[PDB]
Ligand binder design. Structure first.
Ligand SMILES: *[C@@H]1O[C@H](CO)[C@@H](O[C@@H]2O[C@H](CO)[C@@H](O[C@@H]3O[C@H](CO[C@@H]4O[C@H](CO)[C@@H](O)[C@H](O)[C@@H]4O)[C@@H](O)[C@H](O[C@H]4O[C@H](CO)[C@@H](O)[C@H](O)[C@@H]4O)[C@@H]3O)[C@H](O)[C@H]2NC(C)=O)[C@H](O)[C@H]1NC(C)=O
Ligand SMILES: *[C@@H]1O[C@H](CO)[C@@H](O[C@@H]2O[C@H](CO)[C@@H](O[C@@H]3O[C@H](CO)[C@@H](O)[C@H](O)[C@@H]3O)[C@H](O)[C@H]2NC(C)=O)[C@H](O)[C@H]1NC(C)=O
Ligand SMILES: *[C@@H]1O[C@H](CO)[C@@H](O[C@@H]2O[C@H](CO)[C@@H](O)[C@H](O)[C@H]2NC(C)=O)[C@H](O)[C@H]1NC(C)=O
Ligand SMILES: *[C@@H]1O[C@H](CO)[C@@H](O[C@@H]2O[C@H](CO)[C@@H](O)[C@H](O)[C@H]2NC(C)=O)[C@H](O)[C@H]1NC(C)=O
Ligand SMILES: O=c1cc(NC2CCCCC2)c(-c2nnc[nH]2)nn1-c1ccccc1
Ligand SMILES: O=c1cc(NC2CCCCC2)c(-c2nnc[nH]2)nn1-c1ccccc1
Ligand SMILES: CC(=O)N[C@@H]1[C@@H](O)[C@H](O)[C@@H](CO)O[C@H]1O
Ligand SMILES: *[C@@H]1O[C@H](CO)[C@@H](O)[C@H](O)[C@H]1NC(C)=O
Ligand SMILES: *[C@@H]1O[C@H](CO)[C@@H](O)[C@H](O)[C@H]1NC(C)=O
Ligand SMILES: *[C@H]1O[C@H](CO)[C@@H](O)[C@H](O)[C@H]1NC(C)=O
Ligand SMILES: *[C@H]1O[C@H](CO)[C@@H](O)[C@H](O)[C@H]1NC(C)=O
Ligand SMILES: *[C@H]1O[C@H](CO)[C@@H](O)[C@H](O)[C@H]1NC(C)=O
Ligand SMILES: [Ca+2]
Ligand SMILES: [Ca+2]
Ligand SMILES: [Ca+2]
Ligand SMILES: [Ca+2]
Ligand SMILES: [Cu+2]
Ligand SMILES: [Cu+2]
Lengths: 705, 711
């Protein structure tokens, strides 16, 4: 049903006409809001509760009410707070409900709120107009400063301070490169900026970093320079070769392979539901959590209630302060908020289905981010399977793997994150994520090689880790799942038919995990080889109907626990976790963990807490990531190759046999058949389409802000 | 003067093979026999294939235009007609018109080759199958009429063989499963419960014995003693079906073709070329072969002119089994001693490679006296991957898109051994990276289901234990990173707890990078499930444009199982299993990890890869990395009929680490870019806007045409 569908523009609009009329005037378009104002920061779908939904999907029951969730910024008042407000019911809403206290247990400190655009906007005037011209001396000799500075530019960092309550953000300055990436031109200057106040006027600059040293203020600095105790070096504002560009010099060649659907496309997309002769599901994007799918049904049978992105994380080293503070909790800005338009042919097959996404964020109207998702089938040029017999009997049987794919890409500053869920006709599911886009760069002063690699002119490639977190609500043959751990061992035995001789007996080992903690594995420890969620049920051969989680992760090694900050993303700590699903444990991180991870608005280690995971509705949680030491070949961009991570969800005695066997595209023939004949196999039936083939739609592109 | 053009890594042609055969026939002093009919007592040309050039000479030719080296071939010859019958390895050249033949056996090995090390001939298997079906199985006719539909001769029944044949060096006794022959699908599942330990050391098959029998869960001392028991009542007997329907039985999908899978086509020109053993793209050039036993290999790999790696080449495949029954419980298959090339098979167009791949034949003289030809053995194609190599969308300050969809160059062969269908891959990325892949599909070696099961796998069909096994494969990677002389580096990370420099009250966990130089062979020998440097890479003395050594990172992609424990005498035969990764001084006497002759005497192996790792520097030398890659397999229902690929994609990457000064892809023709201020719908701004207006037009397809079956 149109049940897990993100909110229509119409829906978004009408929640707003409510919120506005029913929060009094004195409410502001968050576009232009100052901290001490009341504004609505986000209106997005409030996902239904699970029980109420299944009821409606499986057993007639009418459908749970369709409800928004507005995050409201309550600045204008003596005790300013943030408030999560459920609104509804949709399409024509009548009620509203502060749920804040329910969830966290008290109000939301106002300093956990995400920085607004207008806030950045103000912060830049405080620098571009009031702090930088103090050093218009130095900046002219270092970096082409002209009065009053539209050649330079800023980039936020990580958490914003050192202990809770702080709202002080280190910014770098970079040249405002035209039509290409600025992230590689760290002008050498970093600035701590305390913007904790509700009055921007009282914002200060607690610190300043230049070519290796720290000065309490900007005058403090420009002075120390003008005294000739500081060696300026002129940084070139211009260049050639990828450092400075993306447009390739080399001109177009013969076009690259195109895939097309000879007989027309073999899947559909209505609303946000996807349907192919193997899979149905519903897809979507959470403004902050990012992309998610639900009600994944493989040939009518539900495999998972939910797979979704929880969080994404990035944790730096560095020369500089702004780098060596920096840990972004990117959901803190928002994977959905920052899903960019997909470029037809580049991001996705020219012939994918490209779907729009709507949102109301920091505004009062909804806007659309066109071509936000793509769905497509993709021949892999690979057997799903195959056998060829020359022994005893002559036959061949195999099948080319085509795969179904849904994808969106989130561009958050330097990074373009690639989010893939892919659907194998073996009944398997792959989640992949890819880090591409630009890197974050420092400016380079000598004391370096512990903090990364010179990738350029003046440019340090600043070491970091990536990590990402997924919710996997497997309902293996319905809710009650257990969790098993199969692996392996050798055992010195006698050889039965020569007990004088020894053999090394290979054995499987199985073990049921009964307790939330026995199924929480840290990065650094050993996962077992075979690990799955079972049902009480068995398949025909008497084997716990099961789905296996096989992880593709290169231990993006974790910020140690001893840090004050770590509870902001305690999931980085874990390779894998399973818990009892619970409406009150609905997410792994939250938009609010960004600006105060010392007071986690949600701390994941909580979820794990001496409970049974024996015949309960379980949910597994997977972390995926790698170490990234940037190197020259990351210029201009980091590439996808090798940097795919995630996991496989694989059938494991779930079925009675490989369901591909019932496949429509299986190919089979014997030594004694005419393999060249169209009704021995259909490959030998070239005709297929009429005219000159793949009919192609005229190119367009989403656009920008 | 001369870059040197010769293709000296191309495997032998038919002519060439014939030539060598002719040469040998004559110089062997009759008594010589065709392999496909040889008795143990005979003399026999087992293999003849390419001999690879020594490396000095090759590069001399290829780099400094020197004259190329003698093209030679290796002959394996079983001398069974004598008092100390030996196997011998013979070099024969120089092709095309040979005129010399030298015995290299003793030089390579330190003495002659114990005769029993030799693989088992198609004859030997035939002779065995007679001893079985014609002098033994009748002694139990009764049983088999009852359980197993038997008559004169058995004919509905079929054998299959296990790995190490015996329990010491010197043993040649194989445990032989027996199974229902099946029309047009896998006999492997339909194991009847009988298993025979044939002793076939003797060169006189008359003297061959059966030393033990196993029916359905008990050991009898001989098929005669089993009739004794059978008819005297004392043997409870399980009746296992001849026939059936579905997965355990068929392979034919019972379903009509749907509409059509998606089809990949190069909408103008292809974009690479194959010319003999040599492939060439805009970015990449390399030669590709097939060892008979070692299997697929490529050589002389060149990214934009520059050679990255001299050789990459599967060295060996393993399969270690657990079980209830004597077959499965001691089966440690060492698949090269059958041969990954030998058992290569034809790629079925439209399935095993895209339809419009370029396919290619593969000639061989094996257990024969005239060369023969696997048709379509290799395929080469440009797979678009559906997925950017890189992109960046900019909404912030500056409005631009720049990106490029990864398209990729693949080279595939599949060895089919018994049940196994190994897909071998080598994949070339526009980034300048090289991905090795490996799959296992096909059917699964199974046992008759009986008793302790769960300790040895899952039941997977009626009477059918999908037994537990591990996989391993070994690879040779002779990088030669901008030069022969390389070192190996090991970078990783660490967190240092420090006080925040600008607020000394507080701490931070300070992220740092750790570069450590690996200087001795043993410091770069990493064992299974272990300490493994996140960034491990081989590099040059020479540095890039920003001062960092020029390097290639080896990124492993394995899930390996517990190796065979080292306390087994048999362990030595695949010592490479116990390593994820090694790096050694590359040598002419260290050419292969394994040996076709290891398989039948791992107790005294022909090669023991652990020998390559001796107190030796790897500080600036010719360096060859050795990646072991694989995993554990507990079969299950969805392995029926075939184990599927999805998720068993094992192997590794070769990834460029400060080898360049920028990403090569910056220069790709297929790159795309536009500014906000432009129309991206206009053909001159965007190559892709021009695809509808023009390119479209799919080609007419070649008529399908499979390359059929052997004998
Ligand atoms: C976080 O911050 C938010 C916003 O500041 C809080 O939201 C309000 O909190 C206060 C209590 O702390 C409550 O405000 C109530 O406002 C209502 C205003 O009237 C409504 O609109 C119309 C009339 O214009 C009516 O038709 C509706 O029935 C509404 O009532 C009002 O109902 C209520 O009552 C009265 O109480 C006092 C004392 O007598 C008077 O000041 C007032 O004039 C009136 O007589 C409150 O004033 C309510 O909880 C929230 N209001 C809204 C709109 O959300 C959160 O409570 C804060 N969170 C935390 C944890 O503190
Ligand atoms: C393995 O087997 C081969 C063949 O059985 C052995 O090689 C053979 O060695 C004999 C002598 O050892 C050679 O014959 C002799 O030639 C000389 C002069 O030409 C002559 O004086 C002798 O009377 C006899 O004719 C024979 O040619 C040679 N054959 C081949 C094909 O090389 C070999 O020695 C065995 N290997 C080992 C390690 O023992
Ligand atoms: C940063 O530089 C960019 C260009 O590199 C500026 O963007 C353009 O500037 C022109 C100036 O007339 C204006 O029309 C727009 O501002 C931009 N044009 C387009 C087509 O995008 C930008 O103003 C600079 N600085 C900041 C802080 O945004
Ligand atoms: C096992 O069964 C297969 C049936 O596929 C037999 O193969 C056929 O045998 C006949 C008689 O020899 C041949 O003429 C056909 O050409 C064969 N057909 C195929 C498809 O191979 C096989 O001979 C039987 N028995 C054994 C021991 O292999
Ligand atoms: O989306 C923005 C927008 C920023 N500034 C512009 C300023 C002008 C109007 C649009 C908002 C800015 C910005 N402006 N100065 C520093 N940063 N940052 N980010 C951002 C987004 C995700 C993650 C990090 C930053
Ligand atoms: O290629 C064969 C061929 C076998 N038998 C042949 C079939 C063809 C005619 C002569 C006898 C046999 C065979 N015949 N009886 C038992 N085995 N085996 N294998 C084989 C190949 C690779 C790995 C393992 C076995
Ligand atoms: C002094 C000189 O050669 N300057 C050139 C300039 O003309 C060109 O525009 C620039 C890219 O913007 O590259 C450089
Ligand atoms: C499997 O067992 C649980 C025991 O708690 C039971 O409640 C459940 O209903 C069983 N499954 C079915 C289909 O009855
Ligand atoms: C966990 O809960 C059980 C009650 O079901 C209790 O017996 C056990 O002692 C508890 N463990 C801890 C560490 O609190
Ligand atoms: C964290 O690390 C070790 C653990 O004993 C210790 O040196 C240090 O005191 C710990 N931090 C504390 C107690 O705040
Ligand atoms: C590196 O190799 C050796 C050191 O053992 C030396 O002779 C050679 O000159 C060196 N080359 C460079 C570029 O450092
Ligand atoms: C390696 O040999 C031994 C240890 O195996 C040691 O004494 C020696 O110093 C090493 N030799 C050289 C030449 O590097
Ligand atoms: Ca819990
Ligand atoms: Ca569940
Ligand atoms: Ca060595
Ligand atoms: Ca080397
Ligand atoms: Cu990165
Ligand atoms: Cu397997």
């Amino acid at each position: 049903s149109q049940l897990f569908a993100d909110l229509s523009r119409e829906e978004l609009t009408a929640v707003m006409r409510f919120l506005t009329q029913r929060l009094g005037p004195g409410l502001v378009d968050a576009a232009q809001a100052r901290p001490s104002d009341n504004c609505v920061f986000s209106v997005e779908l409030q996902l239904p509760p699970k029980a109420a939904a299944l009821a409606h999907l499986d057993r007639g029951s009418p459908p749970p009410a369709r409800e928004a969730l507005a995050i409201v910024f309550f600045g204008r008042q003596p005790q300013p707070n943030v408030s999560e407000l459920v609104v509804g019911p949709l399409p024509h809403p009548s009620y509203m409900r502060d749920v804040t206290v329910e969830r966290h247990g008290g109000p939301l400190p106002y300093h956990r709120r995400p920085v607004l655009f207008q806030e950045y906007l103000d912060i830049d005037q405080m620098i571009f107009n009031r702090e930088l011209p103090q050093a218009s001396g130095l900046l002219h000799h270092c970096c082409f400063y002209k009065h009053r500075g539209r050649n330079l530019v800023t980039m936020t960092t990580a958490p914003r301070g050192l202990q809770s309550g702080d709202r002080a953000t280190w910014f770098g300055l970079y040249y405002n490169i035209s039509g290409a990436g600025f992230f590689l031109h760290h002008v050498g200057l970093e600035l701590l900026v305390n913007h904790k106040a509700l009055d921007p006027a009282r914002w200060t600059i607690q610190k300043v970093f230049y070519q290796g040293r720290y000065y309490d203020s900007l005058a403090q600095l420009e002075a120390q320079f003008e005294a000739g105790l500081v060696n300026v070096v002129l940084i070139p504002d211009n260049g050639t070769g990828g450092s400075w560009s993306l447009k390739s010099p080399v001109p177009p060649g013969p076009a690259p392979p195109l895939q097309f659907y000879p007989q027309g496309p073999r899947f559909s997309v209505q609303g946000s539901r996807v349907a192919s002769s193997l899979w149905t599901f519903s897809f979507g994007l959470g403004a902050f959590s990012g992309p998610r799918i639900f009600d994944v049904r493989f040939q009518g049978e539900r495999l998972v209630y939910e797979i979704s992105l929880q969080e994404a994380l990035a944790i730096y080293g560095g020369n500089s302060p702004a780098a060596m503070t920096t840990r972004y909790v990117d959901g803190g800005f928002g994977m959905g908020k920052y899903t960019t338009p997909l470029t037809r042919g580049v991001d996705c097959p020219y012939l994918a289905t490209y779907v729009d996404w709507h949102f109301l964020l920091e505004s009062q109207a909804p806007k659309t981010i066109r071509d936000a998702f793509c769905v497509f089938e993709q021949n892999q040029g690979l057997p799903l399977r195959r056998h060829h017999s020359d022994l005893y009997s002559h036959y061949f049987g195999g099948l080319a793997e085509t795969v179904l794919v849904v994808r969106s890409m989130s561009t958050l500053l330097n990074y373009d994150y690639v989010w893939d869920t892919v659907f194998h006709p073996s009944g398997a599911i792959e989640i992949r994520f890819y880090a591409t886009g630009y890197i974050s760069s420092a400016f380079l002063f000598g004391a370096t090689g512990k903090y990364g690699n010179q990738v350029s002119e003046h440019t340090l490639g600043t070491v970091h880790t990536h990590s990402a977190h997924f919710k996997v609500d497997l309902d293996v043959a319905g809710l009650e799942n257990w969790v098993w751990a199969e692996d392996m061992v050798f055992v010195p035995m006698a050889v039965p038919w020569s007990p004088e001789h020894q053999l090394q007996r290979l054995q499987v080992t199985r073990k049921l995990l009964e307790m939330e903690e026995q199924a929480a594995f840290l990065v650094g420890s050993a996962t077992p080889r075979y690990l799955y969620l079972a049902s009480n049920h068995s398949n025909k051969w008497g084997h716990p109907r099961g789905y296996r989680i096989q992880m593709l992760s290169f231990a993006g090694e974790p910020l140690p626990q001893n840090s004050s900050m770590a509870r902001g993303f305690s999931w980085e700590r874990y390779q894998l976790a399973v818990t009892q699903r619970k409406e009150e444990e609905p997410s792994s991180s939250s938009v609010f963990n960004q600006n105060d991870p010392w007071a986690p608005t949600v701390d994941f280690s909580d979820f794990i807490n001496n409970e049974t995971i024996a015949g309960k509705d379980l949910v597994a949680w997977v972390t995926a990531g790698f170490l990234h030491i940037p190197h020259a070949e990351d210029i201009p961009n980091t590439v996808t190759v090798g940097n795919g991570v995630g996991f496989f969800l694989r059938p494991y005695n779930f079925f009675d046999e490989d369901p591909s066997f019932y496949s429509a595209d299986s190919i089979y023939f014997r030594g004694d058949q005419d393999a060249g004949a169209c009704e021995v196999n259909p490959l030998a039936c070239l005709p297929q389409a009429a005219a000159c083939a793949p009919d192609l739609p005229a190119f367009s592109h989403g656009g920008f802000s």
